[PDB]
């Protein structure tokens, strides 16, 4: 999953590995030259033969650091471009999955997927292969050079190396499970924070700050973070101390000064250890700190690829106008939990169909099935003869318009929430749609007119934003219109006015109306009563009243 996701970055990462091998050899280059030059100096060689090489080696110090800085600046560009393409792919995929995915997952998890998981790949791209190649090359090369130089001090050099390896292994084992649990806690905390901000009236009226589940999750997450990061940071700091240049220098001198003072080691043979032996500790520390980043990146890549491999709302190849036909439709939000049970319904042009019934009967899920937010488990739905599973999203949603029960405004102007379907619509079209929905008068009273933003907190009343959504659907101007519990928050005057406007605009169109106020659907050509996910009676208002079924009971209950 991670390998299949990061396959496009094969050759940039291989190039990074090779270039970092060359760069770490360049880092080790001036110190070898200076070791040789100092050996020749202390051997009595003429300085005339060593000025040029000496200045060359002294100026070469830190050249590899500059080359590594340039390589990281390039690989940051590579990672940024890859993350942009990856987020584009993620947003493309999410645009086609069924909405059961969104409802079961939430918005905080989607935010984590798009932003944090792609950002979690930063170390795996920009630093992982450089750090690995550097820590394999520079430590091994330096240890080989020091062992062929003098094995005795190389052995004490091996002590902090093995200690560091043990610390790295135990840290990785200890914190591996915590890193696996980390993104789940992150998305849970994000969801709780989003609910805390969104559900502020509920928090304030019921319980306040003290009783909120947000505080409980916050405390639990902070406990998780403390337990995760205390041993992890302790191991990180101990690994830093073990591999620090000060520690290597001290160990070198502890092993060498007794050897130099005795007639065992020449003092000139400590120069390789003094110059080179202190340089490869940070290279090891890089991978030691990077193994957590590798785990985070691999887990995030697996999550991203898992979301990118999911089934979506594909378009079939199977391949009267204005007609919508539900043909033995059945649907289950969960396995074995039906919400629709073999519903057969035909919506025809020039007619108004009323879908009534108890709450939770399945009216909104039926309207969603018409939208193909989810695929029908059985049966088929066909608009203008074409099965909606064969129509693309552009072909489908150009045929059917929707006024959802939950009026979901977007962060933007009132002229953008209206004309969301047709953003390039003229402002006069927006004004006409608003007048039809009776929200033009309200928008005129706003401070900046039709450009007033409708973000979080800068909202309207419920009926007003419902009218805004009605204006959106009006300006879409589709052959088929679906009204999922529209005008629920509208007062009788506003409800009557928008009903008259919709009747004027949909005289020849196919209208599906979902309503609980049965007095608003008395003129429907075909009233359909949906109870427990199955149609129990169909007819006109008078026929359903005379039948004495569920519609008669609902009508009696509402008076």
């Amino acid at each position: 999953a991670g390998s299949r996701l990061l396959a496009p970055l094969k050759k940039p990462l291989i190039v990074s590995g090779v270039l970092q091998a060359l760069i770490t050899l360049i880092e080790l280059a001036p110190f070898v030259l200076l070791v040789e030059l100092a050996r020749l100096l202390l051997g009595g060689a003429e300085a005339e033969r060593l000025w040029t090489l000496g200045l060359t080696a002294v100026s070469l110090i830190g050249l590899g650091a500059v080359l590594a800085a340039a390589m990281t600046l390039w690989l940051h560009r590579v990672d940024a471009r890859f993350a942009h393409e990856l987020r584009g792919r993620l947003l493309t995929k999410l645009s086609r999955l069924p909405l059961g995915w969104f409802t079961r997952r939430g918005s905080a998890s989607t935010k984590q997927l798009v932003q944090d998981d792609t950002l979690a790949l930063h170390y795996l791209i920009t630093h992982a292969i450089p750090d690995a190649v550097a820590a394999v090359v520079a430590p091994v090369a330096v240890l080989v050079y020091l062992f062929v130089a003098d094995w005795r001090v190389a052995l004490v050099l091996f002590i902090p190396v093995l200690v560091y390896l043990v610390l790295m292994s135990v840290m990785t084992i200890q914190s591996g499970s915590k890193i696996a649990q980390a993104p789940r806690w992150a998305e849970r905390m994000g969801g709780e924070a989003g609910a805390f901000l969104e559900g502020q009236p509920v928090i304030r009226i019921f319980g306040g700050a003290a009783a909120s589940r947000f505080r409980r999750r916050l405390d639990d997450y902070i406990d998780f973070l403390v337990s995760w990061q205390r041993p992890f940071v302790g191991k990180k700091t101990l690994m830093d101390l073990v591999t620090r240049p000060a520690t290597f220098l001290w160990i070198i001198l502890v092993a060498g000064v007794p050897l130099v003072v005795t007639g065992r080691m020449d003092p000139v043979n400590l120069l390789p250890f003094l110059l080179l032996g202190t340089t490869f500790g940070a290279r090891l520390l890089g991978i030691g700190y990077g193994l957590s980043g590798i785990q985070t990146g691999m887990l995030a890549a697996r999550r991203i690829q898992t979301v990118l491999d999911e089934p979506e709302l594909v378009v079939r190849d199977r391949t009267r106008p204005g007609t919508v036909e539900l043909d033995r439709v059945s649907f289950e939000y969960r396995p074995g939990v039906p919400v629709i049970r073999d519903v057969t319904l035909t919506l025809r042009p020039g007619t108004v169909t009323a879908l009534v019934g108890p709450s939770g009967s399945g009216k909104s899920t039926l309207a969603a099935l018409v939208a193909r937010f989810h695929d029908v488990t059985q049966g088929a739905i066909r608009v203008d003869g074409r099965d909606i599973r064969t129509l693309t999203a552009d072909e489908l949603y150009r045929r059917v318009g929707f006024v959802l029960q939950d009026a979901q405004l977007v962060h933007g102007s009132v002229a953008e929430n209206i004309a969301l379907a047709e953003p390039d619509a003229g402002l006069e079209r927006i004004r006409t749609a608003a007048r039809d929905a009776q929200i033009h008068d309200r928008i005129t009273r706003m401070p900046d007119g039709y450009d007033s933003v409708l973000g979080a907190g800068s909202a309207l009343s419920g009926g007003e934003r419902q009218r805004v959504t009605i204006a959106r659907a009006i300006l879409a101007d589709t052959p088929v219109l679906v009204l999922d519990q529209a005008t629920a928050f509208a007062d009788p005057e506003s409800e009557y006015l928008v009903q008259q406007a919709i009747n004027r605009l949909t005289r020849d169109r196919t209208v599906l109306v979902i309503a609980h106020r049965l007095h608003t659907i008395t003129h429907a050509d075909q009233i359909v009563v949906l109870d427990d996910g199955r149609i129990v009676e169909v007819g006109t208002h008078d026929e359903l009243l005379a039948a004495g079924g569920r519609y008669r009971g609902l009508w009696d209950s509402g008076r």
């Binding site: 202390l42 110090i61 500059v66 409802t103 901000l197 001290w250 939770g360 318009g401 939950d406």
Partner: protein, 563 residues
């Protein structure tokens, strides 16, 4: 760094002082241990190499002291980081419910979400990850320069000149990438908000075909975020180049002075060979500060967001309490005037609701009746005038006793993600199961339990999205009815409920045995059947008032509204 110190607990400042002292001590010990090699090799390469034992002992002492001080500094940094995390996050949790509702603009909501989103380990380990290595690398070459003055004054002066060049490069690099990093952070926050909207508003975006990246607002935000990020990457190029040039200049000064001293005979060849290692130690922090300097702007922005959340203006909160124990208070508005910004919602609305009786508020949309319920509930406060609960100004009421005095059914019911039973228990988490069952029966939530497969343990989505509109409305009604508060504000509780459930819920709202002063907002006449009094709110004025039958007979705006 003043922004970080401002967020530390006042009870955790001794730890800050100890951490600063130990950081300075660690830098001093590292510099001394680096420079002590010069005497060490001078004695080791001398004609009597036994003289290196003393410098080896001093090196060992400084190294062990460095290990001890560094472990203690790491401990203190971890403690300070997690203490700052806990205090800031808990203060934001405690403050945000008290923050005024007008403060929650989309920008402020984004800032609050980003501040809460910093709870992760990035900000928790800030002191160990950024401040400790940054300070150590910044002050290490300065300390090495000071330490070298005991070896040779001009050598130490050259080292300090390199340090001055390093600090100048640091300041210039910080200044160059300031605007680019700020714009990058802004675009990243906008992209996060648009992703959240994209996931929340997926139905409407798909129906409007604003879902693909080429047509969606989230796609435009992604494009802007990528552009700002690439501009930030480009503007960090001169910073890295300047750090590299500062390193080159420092190396030139250090090595040139060392070679000049060696040529003049004021510095032995073994001392110069030791100074090669000291130069390597001195040049390492030049790269470290270059690598760590970019993270300052992101950290600064994060701490700024946290502090901005903590600086939000909270509502007034007195200390009065309602004298009577659980009795129904008398709600009244006295010249209450309210306005969302420049739009006047209420102007001169005055009424007095009797205690224990049920009242109805009705009228056209945008008239200002949900605003009346919010003022009664304390969600809003008047611009002028006083809302009185039993003769006590709601502004002066204790917030703990203010929320305990009112329960509300909101116009747009919102349920937290979790089981259905958890949301009903928000009204009273410690209520007995009999009380919860009674609340569910009154709200007809019990008809969900036998129909839904998982019963009251069924997992609701974000909001009430995994339930129908009527189902989540009934859950909200049960939540409101479980709370024992003596004031019940009903706001469009019957909007999404069929006639049977609407009638049952209305009769349960009336037949709730608890003595309550009930205020009801509805757009269906059958929802206010049992209301004793009616308020006709239109354009921020109670134009008509009285009983249902009296106003129907009078033929006022009530009958016209229901005509």
């Amino acid at each position: 760094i003043r922004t970080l110190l401002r967020l530390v607990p006042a009870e955790k400042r001794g730890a800050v002082a100890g951490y600063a002292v130990l950081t300075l001590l660690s830098v001093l010990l590292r510099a001394v241990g680096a420079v002590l090699l010069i005497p060490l090799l001078a004695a080791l390469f001398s004609d009597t190499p036994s003289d290196a034992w003393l410098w080896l002992g001093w090196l060992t002492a400084v190294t062990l002291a460095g290990w001890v001080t560094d472990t203690n500094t790491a401990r203190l940094g971890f403690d300070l980081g997690f203490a700052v995390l806990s205090r800031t996050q808990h203060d934001m949790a405690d403050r945000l419910p008290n923050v005024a509702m007008s403060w929650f603009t989309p920008d402020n909501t984004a800032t609050a979400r980003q501040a809460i989103a910093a709870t992760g380990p990035e900000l928790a380990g800030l002191v160990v990850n950024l401040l400790t290595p940054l300070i150590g690398a910044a002050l290490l070459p300065a300390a090495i320069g000071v330490a070298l003055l005991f070896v040779s004054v001009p050598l130490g002066l050259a080292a300090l000149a390199g340090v001055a060049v390093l600090f100048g490069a640091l300041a210039l690099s910080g200044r160059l990438s300031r605007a680019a990093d700020k714009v990058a952070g802004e675009t990243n926050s906008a992209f996060t908000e648009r992703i959240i909207e994209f996931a929340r508003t997926q139905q409407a975006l798909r129906a409007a075909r604003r879902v693909e990246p080429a047509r969606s607002q989230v796609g435009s935000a992604l494009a802007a975020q990528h552009g700002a990020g690439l501009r930030l990457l480009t503007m960090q190029i001169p910073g890295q180049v300047l750090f590299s040039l500062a390193g080159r200049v420092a190396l030139i000064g250090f090595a040139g002075m060392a070679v000049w001293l060696t040529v003049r005979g004021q510095l032995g060849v073994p001392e110069a060979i030791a100074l090669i290692v000291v130069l390597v130690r001195y040049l390492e922090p030049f790269a470290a500060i270059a690598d760590l300097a970019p993270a300052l702007e992101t950290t600064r922005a994060t701490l700024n967001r946290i502090q901005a959340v903590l600086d939000a203006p909270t509502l007034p909160a007195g200390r009065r309490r309602l004298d009577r124990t659980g009795a129904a208070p008398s709600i009244e508005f006295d010249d209450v005037r309210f306005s969302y910004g420049d739009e006047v919602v209420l102007d001169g609305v005055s009424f007095t609701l009797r205690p224990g009786n049920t009242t109805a508020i009705v009228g056209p949309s945008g008239s200002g009746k949900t605003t009346i319920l919010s003022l009664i509930a304390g969600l809003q406060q008047p611009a002028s005038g006083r809302v009185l609960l039993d003769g006590v100004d709601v502004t002066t009421l204790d917030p703990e006793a203010r929320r305990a005095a009112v329960s509300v059914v909101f116009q747009h019911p919102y349920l937290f993600d979790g089981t259905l039973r958890d949301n009903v228990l928000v009204g009273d988490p410690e209520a007995d199961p009999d009380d919860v069952t009674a609340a569910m029966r009154l709200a007809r939530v019990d008809e969900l339990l036998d129909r839904l497969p998982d019963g009251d343990a069924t997992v609701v989505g974000e909001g009430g999205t995994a339930l129908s509109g009527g189902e989540r409305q009934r859950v909200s009604i049960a939540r409101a009815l479980l709370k024992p508060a003596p004031v019940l504000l009903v706001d469009q509780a019957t909007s999404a409920l069929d006639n049977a459930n609407e009638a049952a819920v209305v009769d349960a709202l009336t037949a709730d045995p608890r003595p309550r002063t009930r205020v009801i907002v509805a757009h269906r006449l059958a929802s206010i059947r049992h209301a004793d009094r009616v308020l006709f709110v239109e354009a921020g004025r109670v134009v008509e008032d009285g009983a249902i039958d009296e106003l129907l007979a009078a033929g006022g705006r009530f009958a016209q509204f229901w005509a």
